[PDB]
Write an enzyme that holds these catalytic residues in place. Structure first.
Site, PDB file in Angstrom:
ATOM      1  N   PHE A  70       0.973 -39.821  -2.467  1.00 31.38           N
ATOM      2  CA  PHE A  70      -0.350 -40.579  -2.958  1.00 31.38           C
ATOM      3  C   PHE A  70      -0.190 -42.244  -2.723  1.00 31.38           C
ATOM      4  O   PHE A  70       0.616 -42.657  -2.811  1.00 31.38           O
ATOM      5  CB  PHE A  70      -0.222 -40.659  -4.689  1.00 31.38           C
ATOM      6  N   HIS A 120      -7.895 -49.074  -7.749  1.00 34.73           N
ATOM      7  CA  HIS A 120      -8.313 -48.000  -6.833  1.00 34.73           C
ATOM      8  C   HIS A 120      -7.381 -47.011  -7.329  1.00 34.73           C
ATOM      9  O   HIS A 120      -8.029 -45.766  -7.771  1.00 34.73           O
ATOM     10  CB  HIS A 120      -8.028 -48.557  -5.416  1.00 34.73           C
ATOM     11  N   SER A 151      -5.894 -45.929  -9.881  1.00 33.85           N
ATOM     12  CA  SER A 151      -6.314 -45.357 -11.281  1.00 33.85           C
ATOM     13  C   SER A 151      -7.619 -44.588 -10.997  1.00 33.85           C
ATOM     14  O   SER A 151      -7.659 -43.355 -11.659  1.00 33.85           O
ATOM     15  CB  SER A 151      -6.407 -46.541 -12.306  1.00 33.85           C
ATOM     16  N   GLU A 164       5.051 -34.543  -7.685  1.00 30.43           N
ATOM     17  CA  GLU A 164       6.453 -34.348  -7.153  1.00 30.43           C
ATOM     18  C   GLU A 164       7.211 -35.597  -7.130  1.00 30.43           C
ATOM     19  O   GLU A 164       6.692 -36.658  -6.856  1.00 30.43           O
ATOM     20  CB  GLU A 164       6.284 -33.858  -5.705  1.00 30.43           C
TER      21      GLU A 164
END
Ligand SMILES: CC(C)(COP(=O)(O)OP(=O)(O)OC[C@H]1O[C@@H](n2cnc3c(N)ncnc32)[C@H](O)[C@@H]1OP(=O)(O)O)[C@@H](O)C(=O)NCCC(=O)NCCS
EC number: 2.3.1.48
Lengths: 154, 360, 93, 97, 311
Positions: free
Chosen positions: E213, E224, E226, E248
């Site tokens: 991410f 952004h 969120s 992960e």
């Protein structure tokens, strides 16, 4: 080791109205001369969710302790219900009797207390916001939890 | 990082890992092991009697025997002497031995020359079914049709016998010299469809086959590498697992065989035996040439993992057993005592162990 | 397979959330002793908290007792004398 | 692709036994948890095996007594399913806050 | 001067070029230049790694006022180029790089090949989220170009297998400018729920996992991350094949982002009132709620004990 010891506690007015003051006949022992005073504190857990709802009811100092077997009547008015959550006044909570010698706590006695309406009509359909006058407390004093700590006496 | 040093580590951790371990050195190395369906008999002083079928492999040295042995386990397993109750002279050697599900007294064996034998605990050698002319490893009894037996050999030939009726048990009811182009590494019966069975071959093909149908093959799967074993679940009619030379244990849905549901990693060499649990839906056990046994929990596939245990392995690996010092020939889960396992290694060792997890 | 954060961490490995290693069935078994017949679903986190608090206190007292003895290894007797600070409890008089 | 082993006879040793007697919580994750606790303490002191065993026995005794008192508090509340509130009350009985 | 060692963290300067070229340092450079994250042999070393804000065409320029000629001295540029897409980086020629990305922007129709997932307005600006598989060629190129950010800003990150088709990639773009704001690589696992559930219907069910991410440093802290997490979680809730939402090895930053947005979501659904009004909740209720939210069990218990500490 311990110079002072709790032989027994005995509640006098139990069960009793939720507002009636707490009265404990405390029989204890003293094996030799002590100089400082015993201190009896009584705390009432106003809520199980948190701790800020505790209320120190009333401290009492006694001294000097006479060598031998002593009886002491400890009284303290009921808790301030303006500081108890409206939802949690009714039901099971706990109280803690604490005896400490010279700021040193040597005996803790935990009791369960059950707050119930007196009539079946109320307990079956508790009114929206409780009716204090018809609440009765019953502190289960048969087997309280008596924790004993070792302190330095003199 | 030596076999003996690793074994010392393992036996140093044995107390924390297992509820019970029992090591036993065999005169001759057994190639097959199977628990018998002996109901749990209470004994004096906290003993429990379980029975075992083991084989022998002398390699031309001495006479081979199908051995029926009796283990004594502490009572605590349910919630110290290993004895041989019976022996039976056997031609050549036993590669796989399975007792008939509907008749625990019968026992079918397959030898190094492909010959199938039907022994009886009470009398001994009862039938000699000879159809394969090469060493065979596949032998499976149908848990749905009393006396329906599948045998598979290295000569590409699969044979279906029926020993339920007393008529002509010596001849095979059906044969396939043309189901695979190479060795039949194993064949197994379905646990809910009395007419389906799966085979895996060195031709790197896995075939789901039907007996009633004339096609005789109703699904084919190209394997990444050859599969050495397969097993259908004891709870789901659509789920099977397979393992071969690439050390990954693949899982398949029978309704869509074009694609493995998921493959579990953790074996460092080929896997030779694989079996689903009969007690806990989703538990699979595998053994391979890496001298390792491994129990996976399917319900943990791709689960979240706190990073401390992340390095330890994929989340679906319930546990690992490294008490063996050589390739595992076979193993079996006790159908009466959950998580009680018997295993046999190449170096003439038979271990009986139960892990300590206790959480399904 | 299927992981993108499975490289090599820059720094030392640190222990986090090993409390979660207290399997729910373990708490259930411990509750069976003491005669807890049925247990709620959202009770497990509070038991985790209480167990961790008690163990932190006991281990801290053990370390205090051992460090006071001017030693470097905490032995079973040090844990005994640490549990000593928890006071002797009896129900009734 | 099975590999048939060469039969090596065994004479004598060419038999060890292990049984289990213990408590409820399993030993390994408890060692995990205690090492985690010792880490966050900046401590470097050795922790002996028997010391961890004593810690485990004491933790189990404590939890069993706490569940006794929690079940009791629930009994006096007229129900049978113990909730968060009963655990909190029981823990408040010992002097915890 | 005896100063032939430097820190790869301050020597490496990453740039993203719109009309202004925004520059920033990396968090980790150790997977490139060793655990020391120290480079020896170069005096006054600068490593310029720049990406075009729309196509992320990489451009590498390693400047140094002096470099020791010994064979053992590391080759910074070669090290770095080993991780960028092969034969896709303009090295030490800015005009070539500008021409290349200028002619790429003419035909770079990202929003035309990917599948739209959702939009969202932030600070009065429309942003779009797109989803693509890693087998598509253009997706492969864009992923190999933006892949080095995983290594540079995510501890222990590793390049993923592009042959694997279970990899899904979400791209967060500015709708009117086409600048790539971020990306999230996710993976689908098979989810076995028992013989009964798996036998009922044919459709394979999945545990969906967020693996990587990333919001680029320039666009961070504007809301952004969120919005992207919530859009992905929403598309996964609307999806019938997904049954759990996992993550992960999240570090504390993503831990807090996840907890913030998950508490927000649970509050929008009134779970706060439910959990503060009742402690009698039956196991059926708890399980039905946990599965309706599609949250992992551990995270669900965390969020319950969190919502119990509200007001
Ligand atoms: C994690 C990451 C994606 C966050 O992106 P972001 O765009 O900065 O995220 P947001 O805009 O939602 O801002 C997040 C912060 O706002 C907070 N926040 C508080 N109130 C908020 C509100 N009303 N609205 C929005 N955010 C709010 C969030 O809780 C979070 O906490 P913080 O402000 O205390 O740091 C970004 O740091 C990143 O990509 N880092 C790269 C390395 C990494 O850690 N990647 C993810 C790990 S797998």
């Amino acid at each position: 080791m311990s110079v002072v010891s709790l032989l027994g506690v005995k509640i006098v007015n139990n069960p009793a109205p939720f507002l009636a003051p707490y009265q404990f006949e405390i029989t204890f022992e003293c094996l030799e001369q002590l100089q400082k005073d015993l201190e009896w504190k009584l705390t009432y857990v106003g809520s199980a969710t948190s701790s800020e709802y505790d209320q120190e009811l009333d401290s009492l100092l006694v001294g000097p302790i006479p060598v031998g077997v002593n009886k002491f009547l400890f009284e303290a008015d009921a808790p301030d219900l303006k500081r108890i959550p409206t939802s949690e006044i009714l039901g099971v909570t706990v109280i803690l009797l604490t005896c400490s010698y010279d700021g040193r706590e040597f005996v803790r006695v935990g009791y369960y207390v059950n707050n119930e309406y007196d009539s079946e009509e109320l307990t079956q359909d508790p009114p929206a916001k409780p009716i204090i006058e018809r609440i009765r407390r019953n502190i289960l004093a048969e087997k309280p939890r008596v924790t004993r700590f070792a302190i330095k006496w003199d | 990082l030596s076999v003996d040093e690793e074994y010392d580590l393992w036996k140093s951790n044995v107390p924390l890992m297992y509820d019970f371990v029992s090591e036993t050195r065999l005169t001759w190395p057994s190639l097959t092991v199977q628990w018998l369906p002996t109901p749990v008999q209470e004994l004096d002083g906290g003993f429990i009697k379980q029975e075992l079928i083991i084989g022998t492999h002398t390699s031309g040295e001495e006479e081979n025997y199908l051995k029926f042995a009796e283990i004594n386990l502490p009572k605590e397993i349910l919630s110290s002497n290993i004895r041989i109750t019976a022996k039976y002279e056997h031609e050549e050697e036993i590669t796989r031995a399975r007792y008939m599900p509907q008749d625990p007294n019968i026992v079918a064996t397959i030898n190094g020359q492909g010959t199938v034998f039907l022994y009886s605990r009470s009398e001994g050698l009862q039938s000699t079914l000879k159809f394969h002319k090469d060493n065979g490893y596949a032998l499976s009894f149908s848990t749905l049709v009393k006396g329906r037996l599948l045998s598979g050999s290295d000569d590409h030939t699969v044979a279906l016998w029926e020993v339920g009726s007393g008529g002509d048990p010596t001849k095979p009811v059906r044969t396939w010299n043309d189901l695979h182009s190479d060795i039949i590494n194993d064949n197994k019966w379905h646990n809910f469809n009395k007419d389906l069975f799966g085979t895996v071959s060195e031709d790197s093909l896995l075939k789901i086959n039907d007996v009633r149908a004339n096609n005789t093959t109703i699904d084919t799967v190209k394997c990444p590498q050859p599969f050495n074993t397969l097993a259908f679940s004891h709870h789901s009619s659509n789920l099977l697992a397979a393992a071969g030379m690439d050390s990954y244990v693949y899982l398949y849905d029978l309704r869509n065989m074009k694609e493995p549901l998921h493959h579990m990693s953790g074996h460092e060499d080929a896997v030779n035996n694989l079996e689903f649990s009969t007690h806990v839906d989703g538990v699979v056990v595998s053994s391979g040439s890496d001298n390792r046994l491994m129990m996976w929990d399917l319900k943990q596939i791709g689960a979240e993992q706190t990073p401390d245990d992340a390095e330890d392995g994929v989340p679906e690996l319930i546990m690992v057993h490294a008490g063996h010092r050589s390739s595992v020939n076979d193993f079996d889960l006790n159908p009466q005592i959950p998580w009680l396992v018997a295993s046999a290694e190449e170096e003439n060792i038979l271990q009986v162990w139960k892990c300590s997890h206790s959480l399904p | 397979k299927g992981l993108g954060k499975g490289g090599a961490k820059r720094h030392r490995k640190i222990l986090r959330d090993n409390i979660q290693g207290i399997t729910k069935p373990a708490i259930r078994r411990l509750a069976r002793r003491g005669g807890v017949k049925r247990i709620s679903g959202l009770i497990y986190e509070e038991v985790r908290a209480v167990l961790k608090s008690f163990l932190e206190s006991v281990i801290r007292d053990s370390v205090t007792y051992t460090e006071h003895a001017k030693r470097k290894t905490v032995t079973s007797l040090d844990v005994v004398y640490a549990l000593k600070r928890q006071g002797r409890t009896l129900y009734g008089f | 692709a099975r590999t048939k082993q060469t039969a090596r006879k065994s004479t004598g040793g060419k038999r060890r036994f292990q049984k289990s007697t213990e408590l409820l919580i399993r030993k390994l994750p408890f060692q995990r948890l205690v090492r985690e606790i010792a880490q966050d303490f900046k401590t470097d002191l050795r922790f002996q095996s028997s010391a961890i065993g004593a810690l485990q026995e004491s933790v189990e005794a404590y939890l069993v007594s706490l569940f006794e008192d929690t079940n009791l508090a629930a009994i006096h509340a007229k129900r049978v399913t113990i909730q968060k509130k009963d655990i909190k009350l029981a823990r408040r009985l010992r002097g915890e806050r | 001067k005896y100063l032939w060692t430097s820190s790869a963290n301050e020597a490496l300067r990453v740039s993203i070029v719109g009309e202004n070229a925004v520059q920033f340092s990396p968090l980790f450079t150790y997977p490139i230049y060793g655990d020391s994250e120290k480079i020896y042999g170069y005096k006054d070393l600068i490593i310029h790694l720049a990406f075009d804000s729309v196509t992320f065409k990489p451009y590498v320029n390693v400047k140094y006022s002096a470099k020791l000629g010994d064979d053992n001295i590391v080759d910074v540029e070669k090290k770095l180029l080993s991780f960028l897409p092969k034969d896709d980086v303009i090295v030490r020629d800015e005009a070539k790089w500008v021409d290349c990305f200028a002619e790429e922007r003419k035909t770079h129709n990202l929003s035309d090949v990917f599948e739209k997932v959702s939009e969202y307005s932030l600070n009065g600006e429309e942003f779009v989220v797109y989803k693509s598989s890693l087998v598509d060629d253009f997706a492969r190129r864009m992923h190999r170009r933006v892949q080095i950010f995983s290594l540079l800003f995510i501890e222990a990150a590793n390049y993923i297998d592009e042959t694997d088709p279970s990899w899904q990639i979400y791209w967060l773009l500015n709708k009117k400018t086409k600048e790539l704001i971020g990306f999230v690589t996710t993976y689908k696992y098979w989810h076995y729920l028992g013989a009964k559930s798996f036998d009922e219907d044919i459709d394979k069910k999945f545990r969906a996992k967020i693996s990587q991410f990333l919001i680029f440093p320039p666009y961070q802290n504007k809301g952004h991350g969120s919005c992207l997490y919530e859009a992905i979680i929403q598309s996964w809730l609307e999806d019938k094949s997904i049954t759990e939402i996992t993550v992960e090895d999240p570090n504390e930053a993503f831990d807090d982002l996840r907890d913030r947005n998950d508490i927000q979501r649970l509050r929008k659904l009134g779970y706060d009132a439910v959990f503060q009004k009742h402690s009698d909740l039956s196991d059926e209720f708890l399980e039905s709620s946990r599965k309706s939210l599609k949250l992992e069990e551990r995270q669900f218990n965390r969020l319950v004990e969190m919502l119990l500490l509200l007001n």
